[PDB]
Amino acid sequence: MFGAIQLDGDGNILQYNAAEGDITGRDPKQVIGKNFFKDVAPGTDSPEFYGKFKEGVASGNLNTMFEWMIPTSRGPTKVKVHMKKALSGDSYWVFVKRVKLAAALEHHHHHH
């Protein structure tokens, strides 16, 4: 379940846009209106993840980027989760992707 979801101050899924996908045979309304921690991700109901989402809101710039383990068809798996407050300053975008060594800003390779 990797995609870009848009949450509000309360954390309600206002819009859902799957990513790294081509087929659109998944009822989006299933998440529309529901909370990311409500059912979309019950295991993410922790202070490290959820807590940060609410904490950042108080400041008005929820900026968090880290990896989290979520349940899947083949069991629990790690994924890159990033939460950033929208530009309007009245919402937050959630980015959940697969962890495949995508992050890496080295300075130089094959050093001698």
- Domain with 90, as residue range(s), is 3-98
Asked how this structure was determined, the answer is: NMR
Neighbouring C-alpha atoms within 13 Å toward the C-beta of 87: 0
Q: Which residue has the tokens 């994924």?
A: 79
- Is the residue at 104 inside a domain? no
- Is the residue at 106 inside a domain? no
- Is the residue at 71 inside a domain? yes
Q: Could you tell me which residues come within 8 angstroms of residue 62 by beta carbon, excluding any fewer than 6 positions away?
A: 52, 53, 55, 56, 83, 84, 85, 92
47, 56 contact by CB (below 8 A): no
CATH, residue 70? 3.30.450.20
Task: Say how many C-beta atoms besides its own lie within 10 A of residue 51's C-beta.
Answer: 11
- Is the residue at 108 inside a domain? no
Cα separation of the two ends of the chain: 42
- Is the residue at 74 inside a domain? yes
